[PDB]
Write a protein that binds this ligand. Structure first.
Ligand SMILES: *[PH](O)(O)OCCCOc1cccc2c(OCCCOP(=O)(O)OCCCOc3cccc4c(O)cccc34)cccc12
Ligand SMILES: *[PH](O)(O)OCCCOc1cccc2c(OCCCOP(=O)(O)OCCCOc3cccc4c(O)cccc34)cccc12
Ligand SMILES: *C[C@@](*)(O)[C@H](CCCNC(N)=[NH2+])NC(=O)[C@@H]1CCCN1C(=O)[C@H](N)Cc1ccccc1
Ligand SMILES: *[C@@H]1O[C@H](CO)[C@@H](O[C@@H]2O[C@H](CO)[C@@H](O)[C@H](O)[C@H]2NC(C)=O)[C@H](O)[C@H]1NC(C)=O
Ligand SMILES: [K+]
Ligand SMILES: [K+]
Lengths: 26, 252
DNA sequence: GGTTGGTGTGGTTGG
DNA sequence: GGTTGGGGTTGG
């Protein structure tokens, strides 16, 4: 339901410093 | 975690520290998947070859932690185990196949900014996300260098490797219930999971629905961060039917 | 302060 | 039988 979304990131429209690197490798 | 770096606060809210009561020491990582269910590696609980056989009575889970040692006041929650469910087909003699276990908490943990469950994948997710070269993220409080002990949670980003390469890499026999991940020797960048990091999640963020899925569990690996060597991870999806069956039976 | 209070030296816990 | 008793919370 709520799973997968971070109170301090996804839910605040902010990304972590390195998660782009994960998204770029698709 | 070798070649990692400090987690940002609330970067990995599903991370769970598995702690033995006496002598008080860290054992493993784990991951929150509901409010009552924590997913770990089996060998964290039952490895006869090392005389390792723990009871619900023996351990604590600590949820929402950042510092390895200190007790986070108003941050961390501490759960008691009600029931370990080690995989019935878990083989500790051969090659740690099906290195997985489900733990039910005595009492539901209340979510916060620091505590939040990760998602488990389905056919579609596993299918579109488990291709080689695609990178995931491993987290833990394990050893920095092969022989470690950071004072804060560590993160490394590692690419899925293709099964042919996994095979040639180790004398240990592989099954389908495992994937290997890590950097090839020419790939310039490095990093790996290590001792103390088992049970910890291998997560990937979905480009479709913008969610974090737990695709793996730090399981095993010869050394930490050797060239031509790759860490191995329990294939969370391939065991999901069991995970679901268990939770469906002893939850509701 | 901090990812958090408040005499509590620490404390269920470092500096 | 087996890393284990009589499909299964589970392969063969
Ligand atoms: P690591 O090696 O950095 O830690 C070594 C020990 C350092 O100890 C402390 C550092 C910082 C704060 C505190 C502390 O803070 C709680 C009190 C907040 O202020 P107050 O109202 O108690 O006192 C007013 C200010 C006092 O300032 C100083 C007091 C003593 C020494 C110094 C100093 O050498 C430089 C600047 C200011 C002060 C409580 C306990 C320890 C530490
Ligand atoms: P994968 O491809 O490896 O599958 C291989 C199949 C092996 O399956 C079994 C092997 C051993 C035992 C059993 C089994 O045992 C049940 C308990 C014994 O009770 P029973 O009444 O079934 O025993 C009857 C004994 C007679 O032996 C045979 C019976 C049937 C078939 C065969 C056969 O094909 C060859 C030799 C003997 C027998 C249950 C299920 C599977 C297996
Ligand atoms: C229990 C976990 O902390 C740990 C994680 C391994 C980290 N390695 C890498 N590179 N990702 N697992 C182990 O130490 C497991 C438990 C038992 C032995 N083991 C190993 O990984 C051995 N080094 C290799 C092995 C031995 C027996 C069966 C399978 C693998
Ligand atoms: C690990 O330990 C447990 C309990 O300590 C063993 O479980 C068996 O069942 C009960 C617990 O309800 C114990 O009192 C018995 O001593 C055990 N009986 C048997 C079948 O020998 C379990 O066997 C241990 N696992 C190992 C060492 O493989
Ligand atoms: K303090
Ligand atoms: K059987």
């Amino acid at each position: 339901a709520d799973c997968g979304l971070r109170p301090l990131f996804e839910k605040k429209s902010l990304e972590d410093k390195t998660e782009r690197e994960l998204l770029e490798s698709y | 975690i070798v070649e990692g770096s400090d987690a940002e606060i609330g970067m990995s809210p599903w991370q769970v520290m598995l702690f033995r009561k006496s002598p008080q020491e860290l054992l493993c990582g784990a991951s929150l998947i509901s409010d009552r269910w924590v997913l770990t590696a089996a060998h964290c609980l039952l490895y006869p070859p090392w005389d390792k056989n723990f009871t619900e009575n023996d351990l604590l889970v600590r949820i929402g932690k950042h510092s390895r040692t200190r007790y986070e006041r108003n941050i961390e929650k501490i759960s008691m185990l009600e029931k370990i469910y080690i995989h019935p087909r878990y083989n500790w003699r051969e090659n740690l196949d099906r290195d997985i276990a489900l733990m039910k908490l005595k009492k539901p943990v209340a979510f916060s900014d620091y505590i939040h469950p990760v998602c488990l994948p389905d056919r579609e997710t596993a299918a579109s996300l488990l291709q080689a070269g695609y990178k995931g993220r491993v987290t833990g409080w394990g050893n920095l260098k092969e022989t470690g002990q950071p004072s804060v949670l560590q993160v490394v980003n590692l690419p899925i490797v293709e099964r042919p390469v996994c095979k040639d890499s180790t004398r240990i026999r592989i099954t389908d219930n495992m994937f290997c991940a890590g950097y090839k020797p020419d790939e310039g960048k490095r990093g790996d999971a290590c001792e103390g990091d088992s049970g910890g999640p291998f997560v990937m963020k979905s480009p479709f629905n913008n969610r974090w899925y737990q695709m793996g569990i730090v399981s095993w690996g010869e050394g930490c961060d050797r060239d031509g060597k790759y860490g191995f991870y329990t294939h969370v999806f391939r065991l999901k039917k069991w995970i679901q069956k268990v939770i469906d039976q002893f939850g509701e």
